[PDB]
Ligand binder design. Structure first.
Ligand code: HEM
Ligand SMILES: [Cl-]
Length: 393
């Protein structure tokens, strides 16, 4: 209650980091503000899962087509192609809105004759039905390609559709829309069954707007590798989950945040930070030590794209240390099309002697966007983040 009251409005932030990675010393200063109460109806993050059609997958990888699929921005888990978005708008009261996604799926078969491309899927929904749209390029039985453009491919019928102030989710059965039947070369009929689709969206979120500058010259590691190190007290905890917000309960005295970040097939970072109020300003002061990095790896060789994915940060109580234990895996895109995993191990313990909230298991849904200030000549990073707590019904 006393800690929560400090975050009801816009709070100024100051970040100070001193690092040493493989003997390369550097310093980063950051400024900006946080609004843990920000939120509207805009989709700040979203995810969908859709197998297209189970029998179509076995066909593409079967002995008639003798083909495969290639994904750019799309994943694959539990037999479904997984997509990510960060654009849309939901009216929670009406259970209606839209979610726009990214990625491409390419299906190949018959010595290149078959070349089905479905990109950037989008959903319009209303609680009873919806439509799934996608940018579709295909080919006929003689190889000749066709551009269908943005086309309606699926008629949705929601088994469930839920929407609250901070989130929306749903699962819908699907039938082939007449407008997308041509993409399947006359093999599927309009109205025939397709795989069901599942989606979840974050509405609004605790918004961080910050700008970081390397005060020692050129940063010796990629800016994306420092995002997690560079104030989880700015997360938006829904009303029904406010008794699980450790971060704000430790304020204003603050907390110590410690991490070990293992970069797969590369070195590791060890960080110690103190996050507390210094007057009206929330300050994050960090010490970072990096060791065992490869000179020509993705980190010291600067082979990581200047972008950031959306992750789930898993939180558990640590009663014996009067704090929390946090775990998550960051996926950094590599310039060659691959992914550099950064395994995060975290501990937070209060600085003060007062009581804190020890939470039930839950997670923070984080979204980050990296950009540059066109008028800034120093090595820098502009970061915009949206974080919402979830996982407790
Ligand atoms: C040389 C050209 C092609 C030949 C000889 C061919 C042959 C076949 C055969 C024999 C099947 C039966 C599936 C089975 O029972 O296992 C089939 C199914 C199918 N074909 Fe092709 N095909 C060709 C091109 C294409 C193209 C260009 C597309 C466009 C996307 C396509 C889409 C499909 C689909 C959607 C099915 C149904 C798969 C299922 O869900 O069972 N085919 N094709
Ligand atoms: Cl960089």
């Amino acid at each position: 209650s006393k800690g929560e009251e400090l975050f009801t409005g816009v709070v100024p932030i100051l970040v100070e980091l001193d690092g040493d990675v493989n003997g390369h010393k550097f310093s980063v200063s950051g400024e900006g503000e946080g609004d843990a109460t920000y939120g509207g109806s805009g989709v700040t993050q979203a995810h969908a899962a859709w197998g297209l059609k189970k029998s179509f997958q076995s066909y593409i990888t079967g002995s008639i087509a003798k083909g495969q699929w290639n994904l750019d921005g799309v994943g694959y888990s539990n037999g479904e192609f997984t997509f990510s978005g960060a654009s849309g708008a939901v009216d929670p009261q009406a259970k209606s809105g839209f979610v726009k996604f990214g990625g491409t799926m390419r299906f190949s078969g018959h010595h290149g004759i078959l070349d089905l491309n479905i990109s950037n899927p989008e959903i319009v929904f209303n609680g009873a039905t919806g439509t799934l749209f996608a940018q579709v390029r295909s080919s006929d039985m003689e190889g000749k390609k066709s551009d269908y453009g943005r086309v309606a491919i699926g008629n949705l019928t929601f088994s469930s559709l839920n929407a609250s102030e901070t989130a929306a989710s749903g699962k819908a059965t699907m039938t082939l829309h007449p407008d997308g039947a041509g993409a399947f070369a006359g093999f599927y009929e309009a109205g025939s069954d397709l795989d069901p689709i599942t989606f979840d969206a974050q509405l609004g979120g605790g918004k961080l707007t910050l700008k970081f500058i390397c005060t020692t010259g050129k940063l010796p590691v990629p800016w994306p590798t420092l995002v997690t190190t560079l104030v989880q007290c700015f997360s938006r905890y829904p009303d029904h989950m406010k008794q699980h917000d450790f971060f704000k309960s430790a304020m204003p005295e603050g907390y110590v945040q410690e991490r070990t970040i293992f970069f797969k097939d590369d070195g590791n970072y060890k960080t110690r930070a103190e996050v507390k109020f210094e007057g009206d300003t929330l300050v994050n002061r960090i010490e970072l030590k990096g060791i065992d990095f490869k000179e020509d790896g993705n980190i010291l060789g600067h082979k990581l794209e200047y972008n950031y994915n959306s992750h789930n940060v898993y939180i558990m109580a640590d009663k014996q240390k009067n704090g929390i234990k946090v775990n998550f895996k960051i996926r950094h895109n590599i310039e060659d099309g691959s992914v550099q995993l950064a395994d995060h191990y975290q501990q937070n313990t209060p600085i003060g002697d007062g009581p804190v909230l020890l939470p039930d298991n839950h997670y923070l849904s984080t979204q980050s966007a990296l950009s540059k200030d066109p008028n800034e000549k120093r090595d820098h990073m502009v970061l915009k983040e949206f974080v919402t707590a979830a996982g407790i019904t």
